[PDB]
Design a binder for these strands. Structure first.
Ligand SMILES: [Mg+2]
Ligand SMILES: [Mg+2]
Ligand SMILES: [Mg+2]
Ligand SMILES: [Mg+2]
Ligand SMILES: [Mg+2]
Ligand SMILES: [Mg+2]
Ligand SMILES: [Mg+2]
Ligand SMILES: [Mg+2]
Ligand SMILES: [Mg+2]
Ligand SMILES: [Mg+2]
Ligand SMILES: [Mg+2]
Ligand SMILES: [Mg+2]
Ligand SMILES: [Mg+2]
Ligand SMILES: [Mg+2]
Ligand SMILES: [Mg+2]
Ligand SMILES: [Mg+2]
Ligand SMILES: [Mg+2]
Ligand SMILES: [Mg+2]
Ligand SMILES: [Mg+2]
Ligand SMILES: [Mg+2]
Ligand SMILES: [Mg+2]
Ligand SMILES: [Mg+2]
Ligand SMILES: [Mg+2]
Ligand SMILES: [Mg+2]
Ligand SMILES: [Mg+2]
Ligand SMILES: [Mg+2]
Ligand SMILES: [Mg+2]
Ligand SMILES: [Mg+2]
Ligand SMILES: [Mg+2]
Ligand SMILES: [Mg+2]
Ligand SMILES: [Mg+2]
Ligand SMILES: [Mg+2]
Ligand SMILES: [Mg+2]
Ligand SMILES: [Mg+2]
Ligand SMILES: [Mg+2]
Ligand SMILES: [Mg+2]
Ligand SMILES: [Mg+2]
Ligand SMILES: [Mg+2]
Ligand SMILES: [Mg+2]
Ligand SMILES: [Mg+2]
Ligand SMILES: [Mg+2]
Ligand SMILES: [Mg+2]
Ligand SMILES: [Mg+2]
Ligand SMILES: [Mg+2]
Ligand SMILES: [Mg+2]
Ligand SMILES: [Mg+2]
Ligand SMILES: [Mg+2]
Ligand SMILES: [Mg+2]
Ligand SMILES: [Mg+2]
Ligand SMILES: [Mg+2]
Ligand SMILES: [Mg+2]
Ligand SMILES: [Mg+2]
Ligand SMILES: [Mg+2]
Ligand SMILES: [Mg+2]
Ligand SMILES: [Mg+2]
Ligand SMILES: [Mg+2]
Ligand SMILES: [Mg+2]
Ligand SMILES: [Mg+2]
Ligand SMILES: [Mg+2]
Ligand SMILES: [Mg+2]
Ligand SMILES: [Mg+2]
Ligand SMILES: [Mg+2]
Ligand SMILES: [Mg+2]
Ligand SMILES: [Mg+2]
Ligand SMILES: [Mg+2]
Ligand SMILES: [Mg+2]
Ligand SMILES: [Mg+2]
Ligand SMILES: [Mg+2]
Ligand SMILES: [Mg+2]
Ligand SMILES: [Mg+2]
Ligand SMILES: [Mg+2]
Ligand SMILES: [Mg+2]
Ligand SMILES: [Mg+2]
Ligand SMILES: [Mg+2]
Ligand SMILES: [Mg+2]
Ligand SMILES: [Mg+2]
Ligand SMILES: [Mg+2]
Ligand SMILES: [Mg+2]
Ligand SMILES: [Mg+2]
Ligand SMILES: [Mg+2]
Ligand SMILES: [Mg+2]
Ligand SMILES: [Mg+2]
Ligand SMILES: [Mg+2]
Ligand SMILES: [Mg+2]
Ligand SMILES: [Mg+2]
Ligand SMILES: [Mg+2]
Ligand SMILES: [Mg+2]
Ligand SMILES: [Mg+2]
Ligand SMILES: [Mg+2]
Ligand SMILES: [Mg+2]
Ligand SMILES: [Mg+2]
Ligand SMILES: [Mg+2]
Ligand SMILES: [Mg+2]
Ligand SMILES: [Mg+2]
Ligand SMILES: [Mg+2]
Ligand SMILES: [Mg+2]
Ligand SMILES: [Mg+2]
Ligand SMILES: [Mg+2]
Ligand SMILES: [Mg+2]
Ligand SMILES: [Mg+2]
Ligand SMILES: [Mg+2]
Ligand SMILES: [Mg+2]
Ligand SMILES: [Mg+2]
Ligand SMILES: [Mg+2]
Ligand SMILES: [Mg+2]
Ligand SMILES: [Mg+2]
Ligand SMILES: [Mg+2]
Ligand SMILES: [Mg+2]
Ligand SMILES: [Mg+2]
Ligand SMILES: [Mg+2]
Ligand SMILES: [Mg+2]
Ligand SMILES: [Mg+2]
Ligand SMILES: [Mg+2]
Ligand SMILES: [Mg+2]
Ligand SMILES: [Mg+2]
Ligand SMILES: [Mg+2]
Ligand SMILES: [Mg+2]
Ligand SMILES: [Mg+2]
Ligand SMILES: [Mg+2]
Ligand SMILES: [Mg+2]
Ligand SMILES: [Mg+2]
Ligand SMILES: [Mg+2]
Ligand SMILES: [Mg+2]
Ligand SMILES: [Mg+2]
Ligand SMILES: [Mg+2]
Ligand SMILES: [Mg+2]
Ligand SMILES: [Mg+2]
Ligand SMILES: [Mg+2]
Ligand SMILES: [Mg+2]
Ligand SMILES: [Mg+2]
Ligand SMILES: [Mg+2]
Ligand SMILES: [Mg+2]
Ligand SMILES: [Mg+2]
Ligand SMILES: [Mg+2]
Ligand SMILES: [Mg+2]
Ligand SMILES: [Mg+2]
Ligand SMILES: [Mg+2]
Ligand SMILES: [Mg+2]
Ligand SMILES: [Mg+2]
Ligand SMILES: [Mg+2]
Ligand SMILES: [Mg+2]
Ligand SMILES: [Mg+2]
Ligand SMILES: [Mg+2]
Ligand SMILES: [Mg+2]
Ligand SMILES: [Mg+2]
Ligand SMILES: [Mg+2]
Ligand SMILES: [Mg+2]
Ligand SMILES: [Mg+2]
Ligand SMILES: [Mg+2]
Ligand SMILES: [Mg+2]
Ligand SMILES: [Mg+2]
Ligand SMILES: [Mg+2]
Ligand SMILES: [Mg+2]
Ligand SMILES: [Mg+2]
Ligand SMILES: [Mg+2]
Ligand SMILES: [Mg+2]
Ligand SMILES: [Mg+2]
Ligand SMILES: [Mg+2]
Ligand SMILES: [Mg+2]
Ligand SMILES: [Mg+2]
Ligand SMILES: [Mg+2]
Ligand SMILES: [Mg+2]
Ligand SMILES: [Mg+2]
Ligand SMILES: [Mg+2]
Ligand SMILES: [Mg+2]
Ligand SMILES: [Mg+2]
Ligand SMILES: [Mg+2]
Ligand SMILES: [Mg+2]
Ligand SMILES: [Mg+2]
Ligand SMILES: [Mg+2]
Ligand SMILES: [Mg+2]
Ligand SMILES: [Mg+2]
Ligand SMILES: [Mg+2]
Ligand SMILES: [Mg+2]
Ligand SMILES: [Mg+2]
Ligand SMILES: [Mg+2]
Ligand SMILES: [Mg+2]
Ligand SMILES: [Mg+2]
Ligand SMILES: [Mg+2]
Ligand SMILES: [Mg+2]
Ligand SMILES: [Mg+2]
Ligand SMILES: [Mg+2]
Ligand SMILES: [Mg+2]
Ligand SMILES: [Mg+2]
Ligand SMILES: [Mg+2]
Ligand SMILES: [Mg+2]
Ligand SMILES: [Mg+2]
Ligand SMILES: [Mg+2]
Ligand SMILES: [Mg+2]
Ligand SMILES: [Mg+2]
Ligand SMILES: [Mg+2]
Ligand SMILES: [Mg+2]
Ligand SMILES: [Mg+2]
Ligand SMILES: [Mg+2]
Ligand SMILES: [Mg+2]
Ligand SMILES: [Mg+2]
Ligand SMILES: [Mg+2]
Ligand SMILES: [Mg+2]
Ligand SMILES: [Mg+2]
Ligand SMILES: [Mg+2]
Ligand SMILES: [Mg+2]
Ligand SMILES: [Mg+2]
Ligand SMILES: [Mg+2]
Ligand SMILES: [Mg+2]
Ligand SMILES: [Mg+2]
Ligand SMILES: [Mg+2]
Ligand SMILES: [Mg+2]
Ligand SMILES: [Mg+2]
Ligand SMILES: [Mg+2]
Ligand SMILES: [Mg+2]
Ligand SMILES: [Mg+2]
Ligand SMILES: [Mg+2]
Ligand SMILES: [Mg+2]
Ligand SMILES: [Mg+2]
Ligand SMILES: [Mg+2]
Ligand SMILES: [Mg+2]
Ligand SMILES: [Mg+2]
Ligand SMILES: [Mg+2]
Ligand SMILES: [Mg+2]
Ligand SMILES: [Mg+2]
Ligand SMILES: [Mg+2]
Ligand SMILES: [Mg+2]
Ligand SMILES: [Mg+2]
Ligand SMILES: [Mg+2]
Ligand SMILES: [Mg+2]
Ligand SMILES: [Mg+2]
Ligand SMILES: [Mg+2]
Ligand SMILES: [Mg+2]
Ligand SMILES: [Mg+2]
Ligand SMILES: [Mg+2]
Ligand SMILES: [Mg+2]
Ligand SMILES: [Mg+2]
Ligand SMILES: [Mg+2]
Ligand SMILES: [Mg+2]
Ligand SMILES: [Mg+2]
Ligand SMILES: [Mg+2]
Ligand SMILES: [Mg+2]
Ligand SMILES: [Mg+2]
Ligand SMILES: [Mg+2]
Ligand SMILES: [Mg+2]
Ligand SMILES: [Mg+2]
Ligand SMILES: [Mg+2]
Ligand SMILES: [Mg+2]
Ligand SMILES: [Mg+2]
Ligand SMILES: [Mg+2]
Ligand SMILES: [Mg+2]
Ligand SMILES: [Mg+2]
Ligand SMILES: [Mg+2]
Ligand SMILES: [Mg+2]
Ligand SMILES: [Mg+2]
Ligand SMILES: [Mg+2]
Ligand SMILES: [Mg+2]
Ligand SMILES: [Mg+2]
Ligand SMILES: [Mg+2]
Ligand SMILES: [Mg+2]
Ligand SMILES: [Mg+2]
Ligand SMILES: [Mg+2]
Ligand SMILES: [Mg+2]
Ligand SMILES: [Mg+2]
Ligand SMILES: [Mg+2]
Ligand SMILES: [Mg+2]
Ligand SMILES: [Mg+2]
Ligand SMILES: [Mg+2]
Ligand SMILES: [Mg+2]
Ligand SMILES: [Mg+2]
Lengths: 275, 48
RNA sequence: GAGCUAGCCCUGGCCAGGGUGAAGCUGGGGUGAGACCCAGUGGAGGCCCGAACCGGUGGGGGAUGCAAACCCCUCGGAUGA
RNA sequence: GAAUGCCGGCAUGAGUAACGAUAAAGAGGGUGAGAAUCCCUCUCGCCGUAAGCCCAAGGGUUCCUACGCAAUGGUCGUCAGCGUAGGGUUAGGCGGGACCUAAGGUGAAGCCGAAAGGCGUAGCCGAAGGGCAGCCGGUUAAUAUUCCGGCCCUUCCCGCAGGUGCGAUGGGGGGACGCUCUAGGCUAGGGGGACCGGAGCCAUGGACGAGCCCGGCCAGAAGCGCAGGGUGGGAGGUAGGCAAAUCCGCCUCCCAACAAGCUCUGCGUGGUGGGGAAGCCCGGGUGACAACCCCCCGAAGCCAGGGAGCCAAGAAAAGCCUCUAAGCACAACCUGCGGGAACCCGUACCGCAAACCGACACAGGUGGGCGGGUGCAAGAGCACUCAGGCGCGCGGGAGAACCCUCGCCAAGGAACUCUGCAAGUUGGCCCCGUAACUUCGGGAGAAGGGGUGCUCCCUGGGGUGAUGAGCCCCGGGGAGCCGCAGUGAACAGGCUCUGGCGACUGUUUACCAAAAACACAGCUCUCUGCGAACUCGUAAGAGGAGGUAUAGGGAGCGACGCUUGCCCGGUGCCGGAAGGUCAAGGGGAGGGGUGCAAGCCCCGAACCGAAGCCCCGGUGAACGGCGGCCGUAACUAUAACGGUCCUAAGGUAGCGAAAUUCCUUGUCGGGUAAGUUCCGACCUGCACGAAAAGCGUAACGACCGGAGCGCUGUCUCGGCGAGGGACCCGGUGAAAUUGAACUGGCCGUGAAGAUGCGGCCUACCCGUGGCAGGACGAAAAGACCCCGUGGAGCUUUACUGCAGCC
RNA sequence: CGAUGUCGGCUCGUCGCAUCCUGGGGCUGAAGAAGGUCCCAAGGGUUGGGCUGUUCGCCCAUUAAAGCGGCACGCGAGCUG
RNA sequence: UGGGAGAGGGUGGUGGAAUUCCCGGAGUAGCGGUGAAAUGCGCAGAUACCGGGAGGAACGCCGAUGGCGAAGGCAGCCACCUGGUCCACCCGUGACGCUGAGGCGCGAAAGCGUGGGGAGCAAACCGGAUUAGAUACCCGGGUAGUCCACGCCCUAAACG
RNA sequence: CCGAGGGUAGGGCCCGUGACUGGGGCGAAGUCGUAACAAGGUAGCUGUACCGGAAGGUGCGGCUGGAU
């Protein structure tokens, strides 16, 4: 569960923190971290291209194995479960009987001391990774590749999962976390189970300072600006939008679909997201 | 109160310096222009 | 032209002293087991008071100024966005 | 002769303002042509978490000495950061480079762009981060971790001896890390000593004393001791660490294991080298053969890569160690020792400032370290004071008005005023005690009150010792003494009740607004399946994100509580394979020009032919919208009810004379002697109302209202006093402004407000201190207002394009 | 319009008189006392407070009375704002 | 000690029917709905039929006037964990008992909080009818909710 | 020293009263409809929720104290 605080400050009244219960090791593997280069939202031109970014806690990037078909047949003991500042999921340190060490994201139910393996022959058990062809229809699954050998791209956030719905030719049909129904190639790997830390979404940041720790700088409403700045700028006193609600750049931001029209992947998307 | 000129020798040399001017088309035109005018100093003096 | 200013990035540095006393932990009480209650321990916080430091609330002065924004008194923050 | 013309010169204001912090001066002696201002002595004052010392920027000779005083210095000048000249900066160990990487910059490969150029993995560059070997003292007018002295140390080269499978830009380990809190043991620093050293002193009533005053250390290789840091050992297996590996990783077995061991650092000791006060003698000499000891306090510093807790999860690379590959194994490397070698740049001086940034020797700005003592609960606060540094580069008088800053005040006590604006009051610590309300934290320092000095006596626990004395810390009880007064000086909340707005801490209009504005956690809509959407870019490339729907973008709303109604006709958005319209293009009935002709050329109907628009639906926390009239109930009044027009539908809950109410100071109630404000009500709401959210809400606020208590020079109503000015004298000496002036009052007149015209009145000539009614006084070619077929920012269903998208 | 600063307050007055009071009168539906109304008269006087930025006005407590106007709606090189 | 019957409870699994929706085929002029209608859906190809898929909820026959529980209440099937209760033997203990103010626990539905899920149904709501009117009853739509987890709420014609 | 009490300050309980407001009782000669009693013309009652001029309606679950 999430952890609450007595209201001994105005912010502790609402602040909630992760319990960190599954975490068994509080330092990262030295050989598996590299420095994460904070960007502040700036690109190679030095221009802000994603507003309101910067100033968050320093972080080291843990190298994550998003392939796993890298090491078919070679089992590994789950050595630890660790905090990762770069993602919402926890991470699991795997000690391969190879001697090799790698991190994967921690499935829900993973136990330190258990073993996992990857390959067409892997048992359908939590933590193992198989090509989608060989996972039974109906089993929930995470860290799914989108195309073969290109790396796990789907269902990586805390608590998420995709469900195998059926088969058709070289493809399996997944329900993604968004609810979209999509054909994914059967040679795409996936790891059985759902991502752990499902309580992530129940966290209450509690105070403005917490967003700042995360590198989230304050967001400014278009309504608070001037016409030079934003479609919603200006007006005497407060003002309603007085036009269809728009982005800083003028496009409408209430319903306007934005997926590219003739995109080749539409042939593989059966049903747009629900909800 | 704090004013606009806060001398810094590295900052001066790296910004207006001879090597800074030669890197860029606009900077080379500055040098070309100051030589044509006959300036005694083509580039700000900074002691290094 | 970002040696002023605004934002971010990398790497350093700084924040006297005092106050409040969260969680947890231990002991006791309680119970079928519990919740929980009490004491001690503990030392949390965009917590409190207050220097440095960062400010600039009210008033007075200054107004060919000491100063093209200053001075005095008072005042806000001061482990944090 | 005028252009608020241009350049220059010189006036007026004027011997006027001013001479730059109110920390403060006085005298004697000297120097010199000249002295308040330079030197010296004594006295006085100011700083002392600095106004003292050290370092880094920046500055660039300003440093030291001699000789000068025209100018610079707000006066003076014999002086000086000024003029002339001469001298002065010394490094293997300090800092930087011959080392390493960070952001970033550059950039083989590669990619992109009309040109110029933009990117770009590696690599390279890039530091105040990593790494790396010097401490104490002496010396100069001026440099010193640099010279000298003592004791240490580093690298490279060569050699010797011993040892080893040696060998790297390759593999591995390590380097290597947060915040808060913190243990033990030390050190820096400090306090005390009846002990050790010392020149001396006995005053003015007393003291020859366990008297006063002064000092009582610093560095130091090996070794040793104390305290810490780091680190398990052996074998077997091995498929991973882009080759190899004995290394590292993984598995298993064996002893070891909060130990020791090994290793590294700090501290102490340590051969040795130094230093060494007051006082009084002309920076030096003496003190002095100086002594150099004991106790207490004690770091934020050290051991350190220590420990614990927590979530926001806390650089890289090289040095270093290990592994092996080519190689090479008469080499090579490792260890010890010895000799030799060891480069370039900085070093003066100022450095919270008269030498830096501010045009000035400018009350402003400027990063790091040291920053002593006593007392006040603590402290870097406050008062005083050490070391050290200053009295702020005009002075001397005077003792008006007025001004500033300050002190006090009879009686009253907010009567002041827009407002208690301002100023009083309160004020630290210890104890007692503390309300509504509440989100159970708070509200709270609520409020309110008691205590507070000194002396003697008895006593409780702690630290250091030893368990004791001594020192040091925290107490408790009794009895007394003095004053107006005991946080006796300085530093140190006035309080309460009640509304509005915003939940809160935060942010903002640098330099007229700090707020109710922005942000904010939180809520909802919406886009986005990842080569994501979106953003910057012509592109390449980037951000997003080395993220993946519990995620990322956009929008609104803004903790939390209780909620968020009706209208989808119009606009937006979403869905709709029909239909209508629809461009290029396709098609080619039909027709035309020309040729003797084959032919060449042109026009061109039906039909086919996208998005878009039309059309059909959906959609409100999308843009938005949310009525009128007539009638009707046992008195009146009103209208639950009915009728009727219109609309897409007619405002629900809640709230309401409100940050909204025109009429308006609505009406009524409350408070007041009296209340246009305030609070509580009512509801004909000119013109509230539900995420441009509605109604509440504990806590919070330098926000904006209303009231009371305390207390006051705010006021009745003013008075006195202080200092800095104002005034006088000596020194230096501005300014805007200025058509010229020999520049009075009234009543008139005049372009309609006359010193300047008329008539009359008044008036000897010239200043000084004062006051502001006039000179339509100064300043700024009015910001308002209009005008100009003047400009610019902004908007949109103005026009017309363009990017972007389809 | 190459600038003639504005409401209200404070301060400081001075003037007019169509007089609020005080002095002198005539008429009265003037018995007295007190008023009413007109005439003469500008010498002096013409309060403190609550509300509101207010001028004004209303109200409280008084008063002989609580006058009305002008002076760039007197007076910002006098202050406030 | 030995046996029994049971929708007693909790957990994890798991089956088939049906409704709805979506895809493919086939097919066309209506379907639906009512007392009778209309709104509604339908030539943009509905209904009716075949095949395929998704998803939630409830478990037909057995089923009974039946069974179990203290009450609320419990119904496909399997497994595990677990309560109560009856019987036979008449073996053990030796009045160890009954009740029970307070206390504690449980407590249908609706409702509330956080998150999930959402097929059918359906307060509110919109529309069609009915009617003198019809803020109803009937019809076509439709959001909470109904379902799951956790935490509350603690009521009832909680009745025999 | 204690001490009647007086004073300052802050709490507790009770009473009276208050612009205005909430429903309640009664009156009865009114307006609206007809919710319950019959199958009361939608069987009723019910806890709860949402809604409506009003009685009441609907939903979910419960009871029979329901006609046929
Ligand atoms: Mg958990
Ligand atoms: Mg909490
Ligand atoms: Mg807590
Ligand atoms: Mg808690
Ligand atoms: Mg709070
Ligand atoms: Mg609080
Ligand atoms: Mg936690
Ligand atoms: Mg965890
Ligand atoms: Mg760490
Ligand atoms: Mg690394
Ligand atoms: Mg990275
Ligand atoms: Mg990055
Ligand atoms: Mg770059
Ligand atoms: Mg660039
Ligand atoms: Mg952006
Ligand atoms: Mg940004
Ligand atoms: Mg994590
Ligand atoms: Mg989490
Ligand atoms: Mg959240
Ligand atoms: Mg972060
Ligand atoms: Mg955000
Ligand atoms: Mg915002
Ligand atoms: Mg604005
Ligand atoms: Mg702009
Ligand atoms: Mg624009
Ligand atoms: Mg715009
Ligand atoms: Mg707008
Ligand atoms: Mg507007
Ligand atoms: Mg606006
Ligand atoms: Mg408005
Ligand atoms: Mg605005
Ligand atoms: Mg606005
Ligand atoms: Mg606003
Ligand atoms: Mg608007
Ligand atoms: Mg709007
Ligand atoms: Mg609009
Ligand atoms: Mg794809
Ligand atoms: Mg600077
Ligand atoms: Mg400079
Ligand atoms: Mg520099
Ligand atoms: Mg520099
Ligand atoms: Mg620089
Ligand atoms: Mg340069
Ligand atoms: Mg020049
Ligand atoms: Mg030359
Ligand atoms: Mg140049
Ligand atoms: Mg800058
Ligand atoms: Mg850093
Ligand atoms: Mg601090
Ligand atoms: Mg405690
Ligand atoms: Mg603990
Ligand atoms: Mg704080
Ligand atoms: Mg604090
Ligand atoms: Mg504080
Ligand atoms: Mg700042
Ligand atoms: Mg100020
Ligand atoms: Mg003040
Ligand atoms: Mg003053
Ligand atoms: Mg000024
Ligand atoms: Mg000041
Ligand atoms: Mg000051
Ligand atoms: Mg203060
Ligand atoms: Mg503070
Ligand atoms: Mg502090
Ligand atoms: Mg803070
Ligand atoms: Mg002329
Ligand atoms: Mg002129
Ligand atoms: Mg001129
Ligand atoms: Mg001129
Ligand atoms: Mg000129
Ligand atoms: Mg003069
Ligand atoms: Mg002073
Ligand atoms: Mg002199
Ligand atoms: Mg002289
Ligand atoms: Mg001297
Ligand atoms: Mg001191
Ligand atoms: Mg200079
Ligand atoms: Mg020197
Ligand atoms: Mg001179
Ligand atoms: Mg001279
Ligand atoms: Mg000369
Ligand atoms: Mg001079
Ligand atoms: Mg000067
Ligand atoms: Mg001389
Ligand atoms: Mg000088
Ligand atoms: Mg010399
Ligand atoms: Mg040397
Ligand atoms: Mg070399
Ligand atoms: Mg390099
Ligand atoms: Mg380098
Ligand atoms: Mg360096
Ligand atoms: Mg060095
Ligand atoms: Mg040394
Ligand atoms: Mg020297
Ligand atoms: Mg080797
Ligand atoms: Mg690291
Ligand atoms: Mg570091
Ligand atoms: Mg911190
Ligand atoms: Mg300690
Ligand atoms: Mg001491
Ligand atoms: Mg020790
Ligand atoms: Mg191997
Ligand atoms: Mg000596
Ligand atoms: Mg001697
Ligand atoms: Mg001697
Ligand atoms: Mg001796
Ligand atoms: Mg500290
Ligand atoms: Mg540690
Ligand atoms: Mg976290
Ligand atoms: Mg790197
Ligand atoms: Mg070989
Ligand atoms: Mg060796
Ligand atoms: Mg060289
Ligand atoms: Mg050199
Ligand atoms: Mg030097
Ligand atoms: Mg300063
Ligand atoms: Mg400094
Ligand atoms: Mg000076
Ligand atoms: Mg200065
Ligand atoms: Mg010291
Ligand atoms: Mg004190
Ligand atoms: Mg103190
Ligand atoms: Mg202070
Ligand atoms: Mg002292
Ligand atoms: Mg002085
Ligand atoms: Mg005088
Ligand atoms: Mg007085
Ligand atoms: Mg008073
Ligand atoms: Mg009083
Ligand atoms: Mg006030
Ligand atoms: Mg005080
Ligand atoms: Mg109270
Ligand atoms: Mg409480
Ligand atoms: Mg108090
Ligand atoms: Mg209070
Ligand atoms: Mg005394
Ligand atoms: Mg005191
Ligand atoms: Mg005091
Ligand atoms: Mg006193
Ligand atoms: Mg003081
Ligand atoms: Mg205070
Ligand atoms: Mg209050
Ligand atoms: Mg108000
Ligand atoms: Mg409010
Ligand atoms: Mg606020
Ligand atoms: Mg605000
Ligand atoms: Mg709130
Ligand atoms: Mg706030
Ligand atoms: Mg703060
Ligand atoms: Mg401002
Ligand atoms: Mg401004
Ligand atoms: Mg400005
Ligand atoms: Mg400005
Ligand atoms: Mg201001
Ligand atoms: Mg402001
Ligand atoms: Mg503020
Ligand atoms: Mg703002
Ligand atoms: Mg805001
Ligand atoms: Mg909200
Ligand atoms: Mg762009
Ligand atoms: Mg572009
Ligand atoms: Mg790219
Ligand atoms: Mg990227
Ligand atoms: Mg990236
Ligand atoms: Mg992402
Ligand atoms: Mg808020
Ligand atoms: Mg906001
Ligand atoms: Mg807002
Ligand atoms: Mg509440
Ligand atoms: Mg409605
Ligand atoms: Mg609409
Ligand atoms: Mg529409
Ligand atoms: Mg409609
Ligand atoms: Mg429109
Ligand atoms: Mg058709
Ligand atoms: Mg033809
Ligand atoms: Mg022809
Ligand atoms: Mg809604
Ligand atoms: Mg409309
Ligand atoms: Mg709207
Ligand atoms: Mg009637
Ligand atoms: Mg009203
Ligand atoms: Mg209101
Ligand atoms: Mg407002
Ligand atoms: Mg209004
Ligand atoms: Mg109006
Ligand atoms: Mg009004
Ligand atoms: Mg009004
Ligand atoms: Mg009134
Ligand atoms: Mg008021
Ligand atoms: Mg007001
Ligand atoms: Mg009314
Ligand atoms: Mg808005
Ligand atoms: Mg508003
Ligand atoms: Mg709205
Ligand atoms: Mg505030
Ligand atoms: Mg405020
Ligand atoms: Mg006065
Ligand atoms: Mg005095
Ligand atoms: Mg005086
Ligand atoms: Mg004076
Ligand atoms: Mg005086
Ligand atoms: Mg004289
Ligand atoms: Mg003349
Ligand atoms: Mg005239
Ligand atoms: Mg005249
Ligand atoms: Mg005249
Ligand atoms: Mg004349
Ligand atoms: Mg004439
Ligand atoms: Mg004349
Ligand atoms: Mg006259
Ligand atoms: Mg005048
Ligand atoms: Mg004047
Ligand atoms: Mg004149
Ligand atoms: Mg004048
Ligand atoms: Mg004038
Ligand atoms: Mg002009
Ligand atoms: Mg003009
Ligand atoms: Mg103009
Ligand atoms: Mg105007
Ligand atoms: Mg005009
Ligand atoms: Mg025109
Ligand atoms: Mg014209
Ligand atoms: Mg324009
Ligand atoms: Mg777009
Ligand atoms: Mg004008
Ligand atoms: Mg002029
Ligand atoms: Mg002018
Ligand atoms: Mg009579
Ligand atoms: Mg007469
Ligand atoms: Mg008179
Ligand atoms: Mg007169
Ligand atoms: Mg008034
Ligand atoms: Mg009025
Ligand atoms: Mg009135
Ligand atoms: Mg009277
Ligand atoms: Mg007047
Ligand atoms: Mg007028
Ligand atoms: Mg007027
Ligand atoms: Mg006037
Ligand atoms: Mg005036
Ligand atoms: Mg003025
Ligand atoms: Mg005025
Ligand atoms: Mg004037
Ligand atoms: Mg004037
Ligand atoms: Mg005023
Ligand atoms: Mg104003
Ligand atoms: Mg049955
Ligand atoms: Mg028996
Ligand atoms: Mg229940
Ligand atoms: Mg339920
Ligand atoms: Mg429910
Ligand atoms: Mg649904
Ligand atoms: Mg009707
Ligand atoms: Mg609802
Ligand atoms: Mg709901
Ligand atoms: Mg029953
Ligand atoms: Mg008495
Ligand atoms: Mg009924
Ligand atoms: Mg009936
Ligand atoms: Mg019935
Ligand atoms: Mg209702
Ligand atoms: Mg009605
Ligand atoms: Mg209904
Ligand atoms: Mg029942």
């Amino acid at each position: 569960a999430v952890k609450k605080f007595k209201p001994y400050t105005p912010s502790r009244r609402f602040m909630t923190v992760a319990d960190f219960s599954e975490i068994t090791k509080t330092e990262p593997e030295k050989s598996l971290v590299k420095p994460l280069k904070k960007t502040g939202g700036r690109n190679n031109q030095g221009r802000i291209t994603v507003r309101f970014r910067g100033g968050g806690h320093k972080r080291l990037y843990r190298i994550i194995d998003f392939k796993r078909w890298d090491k078919v047949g070679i089992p590994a003991k789950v050595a630890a479960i660790e905090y990762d500042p770069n993602r919402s999921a926890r991470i699991a340190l795997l000690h391969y009987v190879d001697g090799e060490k790698r991190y994967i994201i921690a499935p829900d139910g993973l136990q330190v001391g258990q073993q996992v393996v990857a390959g067409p022959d892997a048992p359908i058990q939590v933590g193992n990774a198989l090509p989608l062809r060989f996972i039974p229809v109906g089993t929930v699954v995470h860290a799914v590749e989108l195309e073969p050998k290109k790396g796990a791209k789907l269902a990586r956030a805390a608590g998420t999962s995709a469900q195998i719905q059926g088969r058709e030719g070289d493809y399996v049909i997944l329900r993604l976390p968004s609810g979209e129904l999509r054909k994914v190639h059967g040679e795409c790997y996936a790891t059985v189970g759902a991502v752990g830390n499902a309580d992530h979404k129940n966290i209450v940041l509690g105070k403005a300072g917490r967003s700042r720790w995360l590198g989230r700088r304050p967001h400014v409403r278009g309504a608070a600006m001037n016409p030079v700045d934003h479609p919603h700028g200006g007006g005497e006193g407060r003002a309603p939008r007085g036009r269809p609600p728009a982005s800083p750049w003028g496009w409408q931001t209430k319903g306007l679909k934005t997926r590219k029209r003739r995109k080749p992947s539409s042939r593989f998307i059966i049903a747009r997201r629900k909800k | 109160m704090k004013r606009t000129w806060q001398p810094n020798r590295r900052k001066r040399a790296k910004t207006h310096g001879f090597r800074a001017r030669m890197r860029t088309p606009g900077g080379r035109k500055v040098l070309k222009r100051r030589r044509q005018k006959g300036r005694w100093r083509l580039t700000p003096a900074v002691r290094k």
